[PDB]
Structure 1
Amino acid sequence: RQLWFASKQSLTYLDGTLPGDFGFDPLGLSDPEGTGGFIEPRWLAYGEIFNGRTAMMGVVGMIAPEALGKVGLVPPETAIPWFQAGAIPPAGTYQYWADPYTLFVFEMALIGFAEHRRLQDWYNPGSMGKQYFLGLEKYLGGSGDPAYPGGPIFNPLGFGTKSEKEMKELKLKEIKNGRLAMLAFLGMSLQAIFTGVGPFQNLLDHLSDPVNNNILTSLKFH
């Protein structure tokens, strides 16, 4: 059990049974003595894995389109740095089949079904496989662990087929990857504010010229 910047408070509750544990917690948050809302160690763990997963597909989409624009068969029109895809109009935009704010509400409705149902199973286990939902109820009950619902829709082939250690090994891989992605996305942002030439370019700027080291420069431009 490797520990990183541990604390006496941390090792009272960070037992290591939770995957991704390294006993790093110096702000009293996951402390189980204080539990109102959103300070439950489960909920925080629930928010930990989900944020990582969103990062794990958020990161890749944050470097895929321009880098695939480096050699790939994507017509350069839809090959753009991530912040000018249309999310931030003052960085730029692109005219998709829609006009924006209809894409948003569409997206917020599609998400609404998955999200809210994803919430109820945390409140009431097995509830989301009870009321009629055009079939599919046989799967949407979940395996009892909200973060790891399982089922043929979520775990189609089935890994963690039968090994808890592997699953514990796997889930350890799932969080450390998750932490890696959260920091990484925080990297793609703060680079953008200072560099302002896009994420993957800013690695070349340090590739062709390691003596660039924009740290010492700290020039700001859009």
Structure 2
Amino acid sequence: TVAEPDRPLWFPGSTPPPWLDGSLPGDFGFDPLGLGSDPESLRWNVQAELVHSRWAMLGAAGIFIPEFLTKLGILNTPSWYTAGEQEYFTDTTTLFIVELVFIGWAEGRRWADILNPGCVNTDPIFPNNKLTGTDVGYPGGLWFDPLGWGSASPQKLKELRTKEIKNGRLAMLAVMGAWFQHIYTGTGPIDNLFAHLADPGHATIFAA
């Protein structure tokens, strides 16, 4: 709600679309297909981009740290791709069922709050407990914000949030690259990086 009129623009010289004013964080005026020209569409897709970005960041960590310290002899975690099968104390379908129950509860809560803000705030068993964040997609409270780190007043919250959305975009792209490299090649990503670094002028995709 501070309509920055001359922000940075992904394509310099363009004139941004009318619905991309400057209020939202991480705004750069990129919607050439016009997929966010309706306010309800825009807010829904804001939630979708946010949650995708946080999921992608978790995933990018969980690949690229364990792989970079598996190449180095720190740990012995198998290939993130082939880690789908190497079997644990149970099988996988039951593991999936318990994950399903657990995470589906939380996603239904987030659902409720997306369609009716602040209407699931407190706990039924313990009504005294209450989430303290007043925006959708930024829950706060003790569980999601015990450090108080998040809640503040603009120019401070707006920058932190833009930083979040940019990290998230890079993480989405990162895990996408991990996938497509390990499907194109039959390697690990850190192997790709080391090979390309040892011969940049030749160890590109144009090796087949």
> Do the aligned partners of 2:56 and 2:175 also contact (CA within 8 Å) in 1?
yes
> Does 2:199 match 1:209?
yes
Name the structure 1 match of 2:113: 121
The SS at the match of 2:108 is helix
Question: 2:87 pairs with 95, 102, 110, which one?
Answer: 95
Structure 1 residue aligned with 2:83: 85
Matching residue's letter, 1:81:
S
Equivalent of 1:138 in 99, 104, 129: 129
2-structure distance, mates of 1:136, 1:201:
52
TM alignment of 1:182-197, pairs within 5 A? 182-197=172-187
**C-alpha deviations, 1:29-58, integer Å up to 9, x for none?**
00127x6xxxx1001111111111001111
TM-score, normalised to structure 2's length?
0.87
Q: Aligned match of 1:198 in 180, 184, 188?
A: 188
CA-CA distance at 1:60 after TM superposition = 0.8
Q: Note if 1:24 corresponds to 2:15.
A: no
Please give the secondary structure, in 1, of the residue aligned with 2:142: coil
For residues 55 and 136 of structure 1, what CA distance do their matches in structure 2 show? 33
- Find out whether 1:151 has 2:105 as its counterpart: no
- The residue aligned with 2:69 is 68
The 3 A distance-change label for structure 1 pair 4 and 30 is same
Looking at structure 1, the residues matched to 134 and 154 of structure 2 have their Cα atoms a distance apart, in angstroms, of 16
Name 2:20's counterpart in structure 1.
14
Contact 1:122 1:146 in 2 (8 A): yes
Q: Greater RCO between the two (CA within 8 Å, min separation 6)?
A: 2
Aligned length: 201
Displacement of 1:68 in angstroms is: 2.2
**Whole-angstrom CA distance in 2 between matches of 1:181 and 1:63:** 11
TM-superposed deviation, 1:101: 0.8
Alignment match, 1:170: 160
Give the Å deviation of 1:164: 1.1
Give me the identity figure in percent: 46
Structure 1: which 5+ residue stretches go unaligned?
87-92
C-alpha RMSD over aligned residues: 2.1
Q: Is the CA contact 2:140–2:150 (under 8 Å) kept in the aligned structure 1?
A: no
Question: Whole-Å Cα distance in 1 between the matches of residues 141 and 123 of structure 2?
Answer: 17
**Counterpart amino acid of 2:155?**
K
Residues 109, 137 of structure 1: CA spacing in aligned structure 2 closer, same or farther, 3 A cutoff? Answer: farther
Shift of residue 131, structure 1, vs aligned partner: 6.4
SS in 2 for 1:62: helix
| Counterpart in the other structure of 2:9 | 3
C-alpha distance in structure 2 between counterparts of 1:160 and 1:193, whole Å = 39
Contact 2:140–2:151 (Cα < 8 Å) also in 1: no
Q: 1:188 to 1:5 in 2, by over 3 A?
A: same
Aligned to 2:4: none
Per the alignment, residue 103 of structure 2 pairs with 111
Provide TM-score, normalisation by structure 1: 0.82
- The runs of at least 4 consecutive aligned structure 1 residues that moved more than 4 Å come to none
Checking the alignment, whether the CA contact within 8 Å between 1:49 and 1:147 is kept in structure 2 is: yes
Q: Within 2, Cα distance between the matches of 1:136 and 1:176?
A: 36
Whether contact under 8 Å (2:71, 2:190) holds in the other structure is: no
